[PDB]
Amino acid sequence: MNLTELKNTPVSELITLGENMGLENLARMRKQDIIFAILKQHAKSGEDIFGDGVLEILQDGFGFLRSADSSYLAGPDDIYVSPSQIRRFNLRTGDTISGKIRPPKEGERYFALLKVNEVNFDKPENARNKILFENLTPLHANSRLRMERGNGSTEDLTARVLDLASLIGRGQRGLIVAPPKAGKTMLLQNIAQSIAYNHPDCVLMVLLIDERPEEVTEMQRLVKGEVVASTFDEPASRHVQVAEMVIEKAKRLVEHKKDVIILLDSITRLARAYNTVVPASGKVLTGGVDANALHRPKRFFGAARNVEEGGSLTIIATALIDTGSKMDEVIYEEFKGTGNMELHLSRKIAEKRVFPAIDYNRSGTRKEELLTTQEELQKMWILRKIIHPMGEIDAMEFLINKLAMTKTNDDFFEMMKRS
Amino acid sequence: MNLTELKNTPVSELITLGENMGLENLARMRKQDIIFAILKQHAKSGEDIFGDGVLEILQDGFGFLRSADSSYLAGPDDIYVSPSQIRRFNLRTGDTISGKIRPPKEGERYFALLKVNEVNFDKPENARNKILFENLTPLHANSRLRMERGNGSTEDLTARVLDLASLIGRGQRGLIVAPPKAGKTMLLQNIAQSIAYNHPDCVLMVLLIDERPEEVTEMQRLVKGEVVASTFDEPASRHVQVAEMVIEKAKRLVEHKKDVIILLDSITRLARAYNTVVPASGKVLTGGVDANALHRPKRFFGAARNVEEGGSLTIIATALIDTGSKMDEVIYEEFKGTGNMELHLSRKIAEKRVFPAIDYNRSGTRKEELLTTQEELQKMWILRKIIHPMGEIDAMEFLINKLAMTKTNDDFFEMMKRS
Ligand SMILES: Nc1ncnc2c1ncn2[C@@H]1O[C@H](COP(=O)(O)OP(=O)(O)OP(O)(O)=S)[C@@H](O)[C@H]1O
Ligand SMILES: Nc1ncnc2c1ncn2[C@@H]1O[C@H](COP(=O)(O)OP(=O)(O)OP(O)(O)=S)[C@@H](O)[C@H]1O
Numbered sequence: 001m002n003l004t005e006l007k008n009t010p011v012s013e014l015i016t017l018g019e020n021m022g023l024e025n026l027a028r029m030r031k032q033d034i035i036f037a038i039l040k041q042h043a044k045s046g047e048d049i050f051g052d053g054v055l056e057i058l059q060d061g062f063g064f065l066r067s068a069d070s071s072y073l074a075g076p077d078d079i080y081v082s083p084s085q086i087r088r089f090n091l092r093t094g095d096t097i098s099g100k101i102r103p104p105k106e107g108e109r110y111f112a113l114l115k116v117n118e119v120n121f122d123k124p125e126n127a128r129n130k131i132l133f134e135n136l137t138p139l140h141a142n143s144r145l146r147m148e149r150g151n152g153s154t155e156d157l158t159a160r161v162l163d164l165a166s167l168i169g170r171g172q173r174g175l176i177v178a179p180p181k182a183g184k185t186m187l188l189q190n191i192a193q194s195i196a197y198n199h200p201d202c203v204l205m206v207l208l209i210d211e212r213p214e215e216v217t218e219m220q221r222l223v224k225g226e227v228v229a230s231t232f233d234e235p236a237s238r239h240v241q242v243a244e245m246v247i248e249k250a251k252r253l254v255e256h257k258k259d260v261i262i263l264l265d266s267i268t269r270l271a272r273a274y275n276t277v278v279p280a281s282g283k284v285l286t287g288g289v290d291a292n293a294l295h296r297p298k299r300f301f302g303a304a305r306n307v308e309e310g311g312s313l314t315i316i317a318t319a320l321i322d323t324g325s326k327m328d329e330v331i332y333e334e335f336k337g338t339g340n341m342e343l344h345l346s347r348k349i350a351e352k353r354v355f356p357a358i359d360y361n362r363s364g365t366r367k368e369e370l371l372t373t374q375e376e377l378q379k380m381w382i383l384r385k386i387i388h389p390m391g392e393i394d395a396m397e398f399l400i401n402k403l404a405m406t407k408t409n410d411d412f413f414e415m416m417k418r419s
Numbered sequence: 420m421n422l423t424e425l426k427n428t429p430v431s432e433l434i435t436l437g438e439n440m441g442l443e444n445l446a447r448m449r450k451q452d453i454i455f456a457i458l459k460q461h462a463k464s465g466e467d468i469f470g471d472g473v474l475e476i477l478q479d480g481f482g483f484l485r486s487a488d489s490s491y492l493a494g495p496d497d498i499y500v501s502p503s504q505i506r507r508f509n510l511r512t513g514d515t516i517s518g519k520i521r522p523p524k525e526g527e528r529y530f531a532l533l534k535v536n537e538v539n540f541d542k543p544e545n546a547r548n549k550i551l552f553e554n555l556t557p558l559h560a561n562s563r564l565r566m567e568r569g570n571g572s573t574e575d576l577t578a579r580v581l582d583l584a585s586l587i588g589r590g591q592r593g594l595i596v597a598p599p600k601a602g603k604t605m606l607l608q609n610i611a612q613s614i615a616y617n618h619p620d621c622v623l624m625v626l627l628i629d630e631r632p633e634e635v636t637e638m639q640r641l642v643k644g645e646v647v648a649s650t651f652d653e654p655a656s657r658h659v660q661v662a663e664m665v666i667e668k669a670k671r672l673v674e675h676k677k678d679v680i681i682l683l684d685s686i687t688r689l690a691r692a693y694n695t696v697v698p699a700s701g702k703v704l705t706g707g708v709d710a711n712a713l714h715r716p717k718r719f720f721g722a723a724r725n726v727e728e729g730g731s732l733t734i735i736a737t738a739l740i741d742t743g744s745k746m747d748e749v750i751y752e753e754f755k756g757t758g759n760m761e762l763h764l765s766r767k768i769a770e771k772r773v774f775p776a777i778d779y780n781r782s783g784t785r786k787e788e789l790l791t792t793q794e795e796l797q798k799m800w801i802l803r804k805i806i807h808p809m810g811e812i813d814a815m816e817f818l819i820n821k822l823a824m825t826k827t828n829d830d831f832f833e834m835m836k837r838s
């Protein structure tokens with residue numbers, strides 16, 4: 001049986017399974033405790049029990065193994081990993097480990113692992129002889145990540161406007177500069193849906209920082225790819241280590257020539273958490289934010305690259321502006337030139353209830369020649385030069401009106417060039 | 420003789436009963452001591468006595484049972500609860516327990532429990548088989564919680580303005596941002612009156628932190644639901660204790676598919692109490708607040724959710740701004756985007772003594788489409804569009820004039836659309 005199989009079950013199953021196995025009062029305690037008790041009960045019987053999850057390396061090799069569906073929460077069900085097999089298998093943070101697990105002995109309250117049978121969805125010997133992520137030489141974006149679903153959905157206009165506005169490809173470094181109440185959440189939702197539909201091969205990851213629980217639940221129940229979120233209730237160190245786990249897992253996955261995509265909401269909140277967790281270095285900029293505090297997020301946002309050998313790590317992270325707190329924009333101008341893809345959203349368009357509220361004139365993508373063919377690039381250039389004089393609200397209303405009466409992007413282009 | 424019913428009766432009747440029961444003095448000490456003396460005399464008479472209250476768990480199972488009448492104050496009237504009963508019936512903090520009570524033997528001075536006959540207003544056997552609040556999947560608010568009183572009064576006007584400013588539903592997480600002397604207290608009065616009048620089924624409780632005793636007495640003698648308050652005389656430890664007791668009781672109640680509503684005045688004072696009670700973590704932010712000191716209040720404010728299984732927990736906590744103390748706006752910055760409903764009040768409108776003083780443009784709610792219908796949603800949309808341009812003072816004057824002209828919200832909407 002699988003520990004992951006237990007964790008994917010709902011909460012009520014504790015009555016069906018826990019009580020049937022002889023447990024007395026699993027009704028009233030935290031879910032990880034129910035999982036721990038049931039799996040201890042099953043282990044006492046003696047049958048083989050499986051396990052899997054993402055590896056974490058502590059400061060002294062006191063390794064742990066967390067679960068993705070639990071948002072990497074430190075719980076009793078975490079799998080202990082001694083330094084001996086860490087040295088033997090040359091493991092590190094972010095490694096996906098699957099195999100046998102051992103019932104705890106006296107003096108231990110964590111389930112250690114007997115022997116691993118899969119590392120990063122591959123044999124341990126094949127995973128051992130893999131070069132590090134940072135040794136890989138980056139490149140520019142080559143493969144285009146088209147967001148046009150093509151299913152004729154009623155919400156597909158957002159994806160179409162995204163395709164016309166800013167091209168997204170493998171290995172880009174993207175920013176979504178938007179005010180509050182502008183449509184960031186469901187824009188990222190549409191991006192995730194389009195990625196899951198058009199590109200099932202690439203691994204899709206969504207990361208949510210200090211977000212309300214209802215949005216977390218909706219995101220979990222909507223996107224097909226795995227999503228990890230930490231709420232605002234949880235402390236700053238929780239946010240930091242969740243982000244570290246996500247980035248290490250992405251690096252390990254892309255080390256195997258796999259395309260990884262990370263949607264981040266939001267880089268501003270992650271930067272705030274890093275600022276409030278990093279010890280003061282004596283140099284504080286305007287807004288009560290340390291200098292080296294932004295150093296850690298940039299690395300997280302700097303891992304987006306197109307690996308020459310194989311694979312690509314794409315990061316689309318949204319940023320917050322004009323929230324009333326000056327720290328937000330103070331972070332903002334430290335992130336302007338660091339991204340190669342940028343998308344502006346404006347409050348004024350959202351006020352007119354016109355969605356998606358995209359500032360087409362100001363948003364754009366650099367080095368787009370390497371990502372698209374010349375003919376549709378020329379069509380986009382013609383659209384840009386005929387849309388530049390118009391105001392952003394006028395531009396969006398005209399664009400949605402024109403796109404409503406078409407079917408696909410090519411149909412829109414041919415209709416536009418006919419006129 | 421119920422302990423609660425004798426607590427409800429004022430001090431004069433307690434003294435009269437003590438005199439009639441052959442007890443000397445009992446006139447120059449606190450209410451708890453008088454109640455203890457009366458209960459001791461009745462126990463020595465020999466008749467069976469029973470009580471009720473809310474459980475509290477200490478650090479070693481040294482269980483106590485408080486009463487909401489005395490605002491959860493630690494006194495002789497509290498009821499002892501042994502760890503044996505806790506392990507037997509599977510109790511935890513916040514459980515509402517009623518049943519037989521026992522006079523103390525030699526060596527102890529606290530009442531024990533012979534047996535429990537009601538747990539959380541339910542049979543004790545069925546109370547154990549309940550899922551934790553942390554294991555319940557949150558959702559967005561679905562059922563609209565209308566605030567319009569509908570009796571055609573004049574204070575209901577304020578409530579009517581609420582239905583025009585920000586929709587409130589079951590499970591909202593709302594913040595009332597207001598400067599000093601802007602109408603917070605009687606706005607909460609109106610909200611509590613509407614809750615107790617339109618929605619008698621839902622459980623309403625009002626929590627007051629470091630509020631003046633006269634305001635506490637005004638609160639208690641007006642609202643229908645039970646109210647708990649701690650004045651600024653008591654130390655911050657009692658503020659934290661009362662807030663934790665309230666949130667635990669709300670969680671226990673909502674675990675039974677009940678609708679719980681909490682009104683908090685104010686979250687800033689609770690944050691101050693947590694800051695001045697939590698030990699320093701070595702990382703102090705601007706304003707003299709510890710980094711993790713704000714972790715605890717957020718949890719209290721993060722419990723507002725709509726449970727898919729059943730029931731809901733709504734929290735309306737007010738916040739203070741422009742008070743001249745930097746800690747207040749630091750806390751406000753740390754609580755800006757955490758809530759899904761905002762109600763902004765301004766001293767500018769209150770200066771002209773136009774009430775309610777609401778910053779209509781800034782105030783609003785998040786994705787109210789799941790709460791209300793459509794046609795009145797477009798009614799509110801066009802009302803916002805036509806009220807957006809002019810200033811807040813003029814907007815409120817126009818709104819109160821038009822609302823006084825009509826009778827109900829539907830009448831207001833039809834009068835607006837016909838003209
Ligand atoms: N493509 C769209 N179609 C229809 N309505 C939309 C669309 N995009 C946005 N909206 C509406 O605009 C609002 C956007 O809400 P959200 O996306 O939740 O806001 P947000 O970007 O998450 O910012 P926060 O979280 O509130 S600070 C909602 O009222 C939506 O109904
Ligand atoms: N709806 C209303 N009708 C009539 N008078 C009102 C109304 N709302 C507010 N006021 C007046 O405005 C003031 C509001 O007083 P409070 O609500 O007690 O102030 P507050 O918001 O509680 O701030 P604090 O706690 O006193 S610093 C009083 O002078 C009221 O008479």
Ligand SMILES: [Mg+2]
Nearest residue numbers: 184185186215
């Ligand atoms: Mg959002």
Ligand SMILES: [Mg+2]
Nearest residue numbers: 603604605634
């Ligand atoms: Mg007041």
